[PDB]
Amino acid sequence: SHMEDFVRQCFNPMIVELAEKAMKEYGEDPKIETNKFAAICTHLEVCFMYSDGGSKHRFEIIEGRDRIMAWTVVNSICNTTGVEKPKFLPDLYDYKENRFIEIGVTRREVHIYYLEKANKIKSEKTHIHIFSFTGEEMATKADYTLDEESRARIKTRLFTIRQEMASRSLWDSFRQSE
Ligand SMILES: C[C@H](C[C@@H](C[C@H](C[C@@H](C[C@@H](CCN1CCCC1=O)N1CCCC1=O)N1CCCC1=O)N1CCCC1=O)N1CCCC1=O)N1CCCC1=O
Numbered sequence: 820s821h822m823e824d825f826v827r828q829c830f831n832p833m834i835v836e837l838a839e840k841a842m843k844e845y846g847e848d849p850k851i852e853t854n855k856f857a858a859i860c861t862h863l864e865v866c867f868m869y870s871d872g873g874s875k876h877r878f879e880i881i882e883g884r885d886r887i888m889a890w891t892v893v894n895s896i897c898n899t900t901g902v903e904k905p906k907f908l909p910d911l912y913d914y915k916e917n918r919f920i921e922i923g924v925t926r927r928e929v930h931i932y933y934l935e936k937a938n939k940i941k942s943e944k945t946h947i948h949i950f951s952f953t954g955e956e957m958a959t960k961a962d963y964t965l966d967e968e969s970r971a972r973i974k975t976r977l978f979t980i981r982q983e984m985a986s987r988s989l990w991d992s993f994r995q996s997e
Pocket residue numbers: 867868870871880881882883884
């Protein structure tokens with residue numbers, strides 16, 4: 820598909836590979852479900868830019884690993900620090916703030932997607948941070964974890980991705996797909 824060719828020429832190959840591994844691990848093929856292929860690559864790159872944000876070895880990346888290794892690291896963090904075991908796999912863990920983080924990249928209002936995630940988690944301790952393709956963000960307790968400059972790069976990157984899809988007339992079908 821055209822979306823697949825764009826995703827592959829838009830994101831770096833390591834990111835594309837982790838999304839491919841993660842989709843086939845859950846029975847989905849990137850060549851058919853090309854919109855979900857785009858969304859996993861975006862979500863992946865955001866998590867890695869996020870993890871790059873802040874100090875050194877600050878975030879233990881949970882997303883991008885296979886399920887059983889990801890839960891292995893979560894169980895170790897839980898028995899290490901003593902925090903509650905979340906019901907759903909998060910994306911990061913903040914060693915500085917001592918909390919798991921769920922990262923979301925949406926095509927709706929940050930309030931709606933935050934509400935969906937906050938009610939589905941129902942763990943209270945897991946921190947939530949939502950980005951949108953228009954530069955908007957919402958985070959638990961208005962605590963945005965990272966500095967402004969790091970968050971602004973993610974927002975800028977998201978909007979750069981949005982324009983690239985639109986130039987290829989793919990942005991409309993992509994938002995009408997989440
Ligand atoms: C050189 C640099 C590359 C990026 C790479 C890094 C992503 C992340 C990748 C993998 C680790 C790889 N695997 C495979 C299985 C076992 C395993 O461990 N996974 C997935 C699960 C968690 C994790 O770690 N990695 C690799 C090194 C450390 C790291 O976090 N990051 C982080 C920022 C955005 C990004 O892409 N790095 C490395 C550090 C700085 C940086 O940017 N380049 C080249 C030019 C463009 C670019 O970014």
